[PDB]
A paper describes a structure:
The membrane-anchored SNARE (soluble N-ethylmaleimide-sensitive factor acceptor protein receptor) proteins provide the energy to drive membrane fusion in various cellular contexts, such as intracellular trafficking and exocytosis. Supercomplexes of NSF, α-SNAP, and either a syntaxin tetramer or one of two binary complexes of syntaxin—SNAP-25 reveal atomic details of SNARE processing and show how sequential ATP hydrolysis drives disassembly. NSF comprises three structured domains connected by flexible linkers—the adapter N-domain followed by the D1 and D2 AAA+ domains. Six NSF protomers come together to form the active form of the enzyme, a homo-hexamer.
To gain insight into the structural nature of binary complex formation and disassembly by NSF, we prepared a complex of NSF, ɑ-SNAP, and the binary t-SNARE complex (21bin20S) composed of full-length soluble SNAP-25 and soluble syntaxin-1a (1–267) in the absence of divalent cation (i.e., non-hydrolyzing conditions) and performed single-particle cryo-EM. Next, the dataset from which they were derived was combined with two additional datasets to enable the 3D reconstruction of weakly populated states with ordered density for the ɑ-SNAP—SNARE spire. Classes with evidence of NSF D1 domains engaging ordered ɑ-SNAP—SNARE sub-complexes were carried forward; eight 21bin20S models were built into reconstructions ranging from 3.39–4.01 Å in resolution, differing mainly in the orientation of N domains and a sub-complex of three ɑ-SNAP molecules and four SNARE motifs relative to the D1 ATPase ring. All classes revealed substrate-bound NSF without Mg2+ needed for ATP hydrolysis and disassembly, and share the same overall architecture, with a spire composed of NSF N-domains and the ɑ-SNAP—SNARE subcomplex on top, the NSF D1 ring in the middle tier, and the NSF D2 ring forming the bottom tier. Three ɑ-SNAP molecules bind the 2:1 binary SNARE complex; a flexible linker between SNAP-25 SN1 and SN2 blocks access by a fourth. Of the eight 21bin20S classes with the 2:1 binary SNARE complex from the dataset collected under non-hydrolyzing conditions, six engage syntaxin and two engage SNAP-25 within the pore of the D1 ring. Docking the 2:1 binary complex structure back into the seven individual 21bin20S reconstructions reveals an apparent preference for syntaxin, with six of eight reconstructions featuring the N-terminus of syntaxin H3 bound within the pore of the D1 ring. Taken together, we observe that the NSF D1 ring can bind to at least two different SNAREs, syntaxin, and SNAP-25, in various configurations.
Residue numbers in the entry:
A (entry chain B): 1 to 153
B (entry chain K): 0 to 23, 36 to 286
C (entry chain G): 188 to 259
D (entry chain H): 41 to 82, 130 to 204
E (entry chain L): 197 to 259
F (entry chain J): 0 to 24, 38 to 288
G (entry chain I): 148 to 286
């Protein structure tokens, strides 16, 4: 609860990298738990935990979008403290997000149903931490998009 | 070369005469003539036997009621053995140091400690023992507030620790010395070198925290930016962040073009770049 | 031309650093002169003390020689 | 000028140090003799004409003088540095002599005190 | 030509800086030593003065 | 290490021997106490050595000795330097009193400097440090050691300007600059002192600073050529009109051309505080 | 004091004493004594590597003192001084006095004033040197 030292690790599975969930080992924590990762006195990032057997104990695995947003480094030392969301105040009502393709090789002009986009975003990221300005990768119609959180309500 | 034979003959004759006189109040004259015989043998350039005779005369003086003369003879015998069996010099200088500390003479005791450490590390291969001697001398100088000698001992032990892969001790010593220099009105400019050395020690441990270390060095001492050491450090950081061989090679060539790098610095840089 | 004057400014960029280095050396020289002067005055004081000591030692030696000559 | 003054002061200090060492040696010899008698009683270019360069000639002369001055100061600094090491060695030698002389007088005083009782 | 003169000047400045730091450390050490020797010689002269005064007064009293 | 325990045991035994010897009742007790305190110091237990040294000094003084007792008291103060500054300070004051009694100006000045250093580094006090520095400067001026006295006076003036009113700092800086003007080697640094004086005058009032800088220019012709005089003139002109932006621009330019001592920045900021 | 120091075999102080004596004497408009003392100090310091470079200043002072005698021998004196110490040519003093003599040869005070102003601007002058320069100007 007070916070424990941890070593940043590589994301174990690409599917969880797409899910943009903080992947940890079974012994470190339990799947679905919410944590705050302290990288410096001024750098605290709220993540959602998703345990996997392949993660070595004592290490916290991060995906590339997470490292980009938080400026993490493979093998970097951090602190992790368990936290519980205040659903009475912190429940998200609306999410206005800006989306920019991560890959420029396969940029397309195909139309996308934004309703299905929102539905899949909620389904994949239900009960997960999101903050203004956060960056992640979202898979829709098997296409990767770079989502940058703009406004929350 | 008849001179060496003549000096040997004269020294052995004087030693034999001293033995005859002592064999025949008598202790003082015996010790004096034995010291003269040891000096003559030393001039004869037979280093091992000259040192043996000098140490025997020193022990005979110890038999007499005298301390300062005994300690002087012991240190001279240690110097004579310097060019002979190092163990005998080590024992004689250890006994001299014990006597000196018995009388409270810190300066000569610490000088003898440094001398024995130096002879052990230059001639023999066991440098770790010399590390203990250097640390003892540094502690004695700190007790005596001898800033120069203590700083020299700390720098030497930190350098040997860095050479022996004791990165943390070297980095701590360098940081402490640099902070002490900066606090004083003078020597603050040399602090840059200590920071650079300390940063190398840290960088060899890892590359991720090298950014934190360089940030600390920059913000703590903003003027450190003007030093080309910080420029080389950031260049090395950006070079090693990616698996590109040309970057660090051209960086080291550019830095070496100005001034030659020392052996320790060159080997440390090559080690860090390779791994 | 724009490129030529950009190059001329780039060349001038090193003049400031050289000037700072030379002023650093000048300050070092000024400090060293002060330390040398202090050492000089202290050495002169020590030499004066040594002259007094040797004069007194010579007087004491003369007195001891007189005493031993008369008593003996 | 600061360099030159430093050099001359160092010269004077060295001579004074030699004087004091001689004095200490005389002290030691005389005191030893007195003690014994008492006991017995019982190719390149700095210019670049690219676009006339009328404001670059004077800089060259200043740079030339500075380079020459620094070259001379290099040797000058080496010469001034050479003396200090020898002075320090002499200082160490007088350290030893003074300690020995002090111990001798102390032991003589102790012997003088102990002879009566 | 510019590179050669610039690098020569930089090497000369570095050498001068190094030797000046060396003599600065040496001068600080020598100043400490001379500060020590002043006190040491003062104590020695005081002690010898005391001893010789005792000797003179004792010999005068005894004779 | 066994060294510490052995030295501690030897010190205890020697203390017991000296206590027994004095209880029976004399120099043997003093020598035993001194040796025990030396072993204590060897053991690295800086505490409790000062008590033994003080006892030895008192026993030695019991037979009218003053020199050996004074040296032992100085050594005890040095031992207490980090163990307990309160006792080190008391021992140093006692040594100063004894040396003044025997008329040793140089030793008294050295002890006055050491006490000021300890006060400024270990304890929290500047007024006491200023007084001790001034006393040492006076003693060394009496001993014709003008360099150290001037250094101490300059340090005192800097402390006063940093914390106290500037009249003493102004006077000291002006006197030091005038003295340096005659000194050939150090005449150049008088510019910096006059620069500090002008900057300090800036704090007192604008017109006063203008008059002071004009007087300095008149007295020292090359002060007109100096960059510091031009900067002070330009800064006074800008502050006369209540223009903070030009003040900041000039400060930044001056810092860029040459670095700062880390105190000139503080004085510049303090001056700018009242610009409004 | 200098005689006593010489009798005590204590060197390195008689030279400075004589230098100061000559500097003081030149104030009272007595040149022969100043010239003799300055040349003696210069020849004594020429062979000493430490003071050899500084000997140039002494020669310049002697030349300045000898300048007031007469220009005819002053040029010869400068030439003689240059002859014995060819490295003296490296010092800017030689060219300085050459330009001053060139200006004085036709009473051209403007050139001499410009040279003195430039020399002062580049480096500060001593009070004695300034006094001698003004006295030469009065000629």
């Amino acid at each position: 609860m007070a916070g424990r030292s941890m070593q940043a690790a590589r994301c174990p599975t690409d599917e969880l990298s797409l899910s943009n969930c903080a992947v940890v080992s079974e012994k470190d924590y339990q799947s679905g738990q919410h944590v705050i990762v302290r990288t410096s006195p001024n750098h605290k990032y709220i993540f959602t935990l998703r345990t996997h057997p392949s993660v070595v104990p004592g290490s916290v695995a991060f995906s590339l979008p997470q490292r980009k947003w938080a400026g993490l480094s493979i093998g970097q030392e951090i602190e992790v403290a368990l936290y519980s969301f205040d659903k009475a105040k912190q429940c998200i009502g609306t999410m206005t997000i800006e989306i920019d393709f991560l890959q420029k090789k396969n940029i397309d002009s195909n139309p996308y149903d934004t309703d299905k986009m929102a539905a899949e975003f909620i389904q994949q990221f239900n009960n997960q931490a999101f903050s203004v300005g956060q960056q992640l990768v979202f898979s829709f119609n098997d296409k990767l998009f770079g989502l940058l959180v703009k406004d929350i309500e | 070369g008849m001179d060496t034979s003549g000096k040997q003959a004269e020294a052995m004759a004087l030693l034999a005469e001293a033995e005859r006189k002592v064999k025949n109040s008598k202790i003082e004259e015996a010790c004096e003539i034995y010291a003269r015989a040891a000096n003559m043998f030393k001039m004869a350039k037979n280093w091992s036997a000259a040192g043996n005779a000098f140490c025997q005369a020193a022990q005979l003086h110890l038999q007499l009621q005298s301390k300062h003369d005994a300690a002087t003879c012991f240190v001279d015998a240690g110097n004579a053995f310097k060019k002979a069996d190092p163990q005998e010099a080590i024992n004689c200088l250890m006994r001299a140091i014990e006597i000196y500390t018995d009388m409270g003479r810190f300066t000569i005791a610490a000088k003898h400690h440094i001398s024995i450490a130096e002879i052990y590390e230059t001639e023999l291969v066991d440098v770790e023992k010399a590390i203990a001697h250097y640390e003892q001398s540094a502690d004695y100088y700190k007790g005596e507030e001898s800033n120069s000698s203590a700083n020299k001992c700390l720098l030497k032990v930190a350098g040997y620790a860095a050479q022996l892969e004791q990165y943390q001790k070297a980095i701590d010593i360098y940081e402490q010395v640099g902070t002490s220099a900066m606090d004083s009105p003078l020597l603050k400019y040399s602090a840059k070198d200590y920071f650079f050395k300390a940063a190398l020690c840290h960088f060899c441990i890892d590359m991720l925290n090298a950014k934190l270390a360089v940030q600390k060095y920059e913000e703590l001492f903003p003027a450190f930016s003007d030093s080309r050491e910080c420029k080389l450090m950031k260049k090395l950081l950006e070079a090693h962040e990616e698996q590109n061989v040309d970057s660090y090679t051209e960086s080291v060539k550019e830095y070496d073009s100005i001034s030659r790098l020392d052996q320790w610095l060159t080997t440390m840089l090559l080690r860090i770049k390779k791994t | 031309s724009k490129q030529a004057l950009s190059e001329i400014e780039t060349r001038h960029s090193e003049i400031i650093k050289l000037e700072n280095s030379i002023r650093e050396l000048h300050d070092m020289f000024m400090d060293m002169a002060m330390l040398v002067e202090s050492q000089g005055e202290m050495i002169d004081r020590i030499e004066y003390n040594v002259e007094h000591a040797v004069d007194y030692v010579e007087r004491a030696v003369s007195d001891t020689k007189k005493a031993v000559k008369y008593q003996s | 000028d600061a360099g030159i003054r430093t050099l001359v002061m160092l010269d004077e200090q060295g001579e004074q140090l030699e004087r004091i060492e001689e004095g200490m040696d005389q002290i030691n010899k005389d005191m030893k003799e007195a003690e014994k008698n008492l006991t017995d009683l019982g190719s390149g270019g700095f210019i670049r004409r690219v676009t006339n360069d009328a404001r670059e000639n004077e800089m060259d002369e200043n740079l030339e003088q500075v380079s020459g001055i620094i070259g001379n100061l290099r040797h000058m600094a080496l010469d001034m540095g050479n003396e200090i090491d020898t002075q320090n060695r002499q200082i160490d030698r007088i350290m030893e002599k003074a300690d020995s002389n002090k111990t001798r007088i102390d032991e003589a005083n102790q012997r003088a005190t102990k002879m009566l009782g």
